């Protein structure tokens, strides 16, 4: 709770050594704040691969979601962190607050390699949202012909 807050702070800030210390003093790997945000959520969205691997090594839940339904995989894909995405798919279509999957995000923001790895790992191309937009629909709407082509 208190250490947990400090762990969320270090993970969000990218303090590999502070995370190392907090874990040494018994910090909870899966510490969740008010919004269900965990250290892995924060490390993934912030692009700190080293912390991501450490948390996973310590038993962090990869498929944890927040009140918005966002998983660490969704943030890594949303922020274009290919290497984190691969690690998260290494450890294991989850829809968000509007039915958007990590593939909707990668397509929306032109993360081609991420799209390739998601599809390579069983991403649902038919994933629909509230407006019935498939990741193909988002690729075309945002002018990502190339990623649309692979779809």
């Amino acid at each position: 709770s208190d250490l947990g807050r400090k762990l969320l702070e270090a993970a969000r800030a990218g303090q590999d050594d502070e995370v190392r210390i907090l874990m040494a003093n018994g910090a909870d790997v899966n510490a969740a704040d008010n919004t269900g945000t965990t250290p892995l959520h924060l490390a993934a969205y912030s692009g700190h691969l080293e912390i991501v691997e450490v948390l996973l090594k310590h038993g962090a839940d990869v498929d944890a979601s927040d009140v918005f339904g966002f998983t660490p995989l969704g943030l890594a894909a949303l922020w274009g962190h290919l290497e984190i995405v691969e690690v998260l798919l290494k450890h294991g279509n989850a829809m968000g607050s509007d039915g958007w999957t990590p593939l909707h995000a990668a397509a929306k923001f032109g993360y081609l390699e991420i799209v390739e790895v998601l599809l390579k790992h069983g991403a649902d191309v038919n994933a629909q949202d509230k407006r019935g937009k498939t990741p193909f629909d988002l690729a075309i709407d945002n002018g990502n012909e190339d990623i649309a082509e692979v779809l």
Partner: protein, 364 residues
């Protein structure tokens, strides 16, 4: 008593107002006490411990006046001509003047030119802009998310509105809080939050500290905040707000006004103070030098300060937005949106849910 108690919101130049009071005090012998209590706009109708004069944006004074909490001011034509007519229109309720207009305020985009030499023109850019800024240990934008005053310009961009104005009055049944425009604006904000591009617990103090310390490249605020940035040795620019759907953000234009309590035994001392001490180039200068007022209602001092580019940006953003209504239902408006925005922003409710409740509670 035979005194003058004055209330003004803590984010204004109350030390400079206190200095106008001390000039009045010594010239007439009437002690003046300026206070800046928390939630003063809510305590005033509870206690009008009542102050002689209350300072606030005009939007809340129509609720005060309808409840009978304010006296009618008695300025003659000669004095009304000192201020711009549209400022009098904003402090007019049911055909009678219920307060003195002081200054016109609007929100503007404020950016740190060392982190952002050219600011974005759109809300869609902020997300990508924040990704490149966090590698530098910084943030893109940080402003008060606890008060809908600051998020409303985005909510009203695509179509949101408060109360429709028809044939001279505001229709209390035509509320645009649940329409598509407002859902679009608030959806963008909630996603910037869910994407961790914004923090939902961001309030005025956090945003001001972060910006004045060069930790975030942008913020949204009004004139009263400029002084604190000047002293922070931050190279900043005050410019138009980012567009949404290619459409401009529409901030609510408030008019800081001073209303006289009806229960005040000191209504003529209040008139003398407000009329002949505060609403002068010297009284307005004193308050403005403490914390800027924006485009003041006084024609002389406003015409004098008109060349300030930050004020020119202020009235440019105001020209995109709409003057606040003063009807008593505005209170319900601000209370419902505020709860909606904080619940959507935090995931407690969905944008549709939060805005559905709010629309109904305002149209009750």
């Amino acid at each position: 008593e035979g005194k003058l108690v004055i209330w003004i919101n803590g984010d204004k130049g109350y030390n400079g107002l206190a200095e106008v009071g001390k000039k009045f005090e010594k010239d007439t012998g009437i002690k003046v006490t300026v206070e800046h209590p928390d939630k003063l706009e809510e305590k005033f109708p509870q206690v009008a411990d009542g102050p002689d004069i209350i300072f606030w944006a005009h939007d809340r004074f129509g609720g005060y006046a309808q409840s009978g909490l304010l006296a009618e001011i008695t300025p003659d034509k000669a004095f009304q001509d000192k201020l711009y007519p549209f400022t009098w229109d904003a402090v007019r309720y049911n055909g009678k003047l219920i307060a003195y207009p002081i200054a016109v305020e609007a929100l503007s985009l404020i950016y740190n030119k060392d982190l952002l030499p050219n600011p974005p023109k759109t809300w869609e850019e902020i997300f990508a802009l924040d990704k490149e800024l966090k590698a530098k240990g910084k943030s893109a934008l940080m402003f008060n998310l606890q008060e809908p005053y600051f998020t409303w310009p985005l909510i009203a961009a695509d179509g949101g509105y408060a109360f429709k104005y028809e044939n001279g009055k505001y229709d209390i049944k035509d509320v645009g809080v649940d329409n598509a425009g407002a859902k679009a604006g608030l959806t963008a904000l909630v996603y910037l939050i869910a994407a961790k591009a914004m923090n939902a617990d961001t309030d005025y103090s956090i945003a001001e500290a972060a910006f004045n310390k060069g930790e975030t490249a942008m913020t949204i605020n009004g004139p009263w905040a400029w002084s604190n940035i000047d002293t922070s040795k931050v190279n900043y620019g005050v410019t138009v707000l980012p567009t949404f759907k290619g459409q401009p953000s529409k901030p609510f234009v408030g008019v800081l006004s001073a209303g006289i309590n009806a229960a005040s035994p000191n209504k003529e001392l209040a008139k003398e103070f407000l009329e002949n001490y505060l609403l002068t180039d010297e009284g307005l200068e004193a308050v403005n030098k403490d914390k800027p007022l924006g485009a003041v209602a006084l024609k002389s001092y406003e015409e004098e300060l008109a060349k300030d580019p930050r004020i020119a940006a202020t009235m440019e953003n105001a020209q995109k937005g709409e003057i606040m209504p003063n009807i008593p239902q505005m209170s319900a408006f601000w209370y419902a949106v505020r709860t909606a925005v904080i619940n959507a922003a935090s995931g407690r409710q969905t944008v549709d849910e939060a805005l559905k409740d709010a629309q109904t509670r305002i149209t009750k």
